[PDB]
Amino acid sequence: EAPNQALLRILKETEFKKIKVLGSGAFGTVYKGLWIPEGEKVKIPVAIKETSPKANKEILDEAYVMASVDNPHVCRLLGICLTSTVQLIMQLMPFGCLLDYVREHKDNIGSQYLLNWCVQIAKGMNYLEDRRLVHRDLAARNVLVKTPQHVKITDFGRAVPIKWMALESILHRIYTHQSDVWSYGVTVWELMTFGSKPYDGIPASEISSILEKGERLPQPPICTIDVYMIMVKCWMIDADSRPKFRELIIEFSKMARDPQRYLVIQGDERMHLPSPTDSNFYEEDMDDVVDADEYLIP
């Protein structure tokens, strides 16, 4: 097939500065930072992830996949640092993961945001489909927030979460772009319920039988039958019957044009999330700072 001509950028340790710890646990630690190239008069906000041969091999296989993608709704690797232990340098997504974002800002998330996020996630997934890349772990925890109006898909570096998996994936370990559609349906459910845990209290071993009986996730109170029907269609036993990601872009885009007709949220219209319109929306020198999406460009 087609040769992968993606460029792997090696970054010098001295070219980037760690500001603070964004999150630490199990794997290691993630830092908020700045990448100041050679003499380009630019400061790029970045996320830095930081010795056994097995772990080094796993982080490089991750880097390979992340460097092989370029889409506005997919998280891309900026580069790698080859210190004692390999460091991954990625674009900063200041608001963190979407799962935590909806749990923390539920009282200010209107129908427009929820529907636009569904479009954006479907666009990222459709791109991954065009690139023949099967995610295998799509969930609200693996969707990052650049701005409340711009989300990107991550953790496709694995390319088990039973409660997000399609029937074929649990029983036969079959992973396709249609099995990713099931996980998309569960992700949409997570957003529509403002970060509720799917099949909460129910053990993982029962999920297979539950799905075979015909039982699915409940209709979120804010969901019109129009939105819920789409989620239900993502959870058909027959994978070919499930919607394609390009159909999900169109369907959610139609709905995003008149959001209050498809999502019923009490307090909607008077709700607001941070945006560039806000005073001081963007710690040290905030001079010559530019986002990775506007720098160099592949």
Ligand SMILES: CN1CCN(c2ccc(NC(=O)c3c(NCCc4ccc(Cl)cc4)cc[nH]c3=O)cc2)CC1
């Ligand atoms: C109250 N909360 C405090 C913590 N806040 C937070 C903000 C940004 C990140 N950033 C990220 O998680 C992040 C990534 N996380 C996915 C895991 C990962 C981290 C770093 C690399 Cl290099 C690769 C993968 C990946 C890329 N860019 C990011 O900003 C994490 C947490 C959210 C608000």
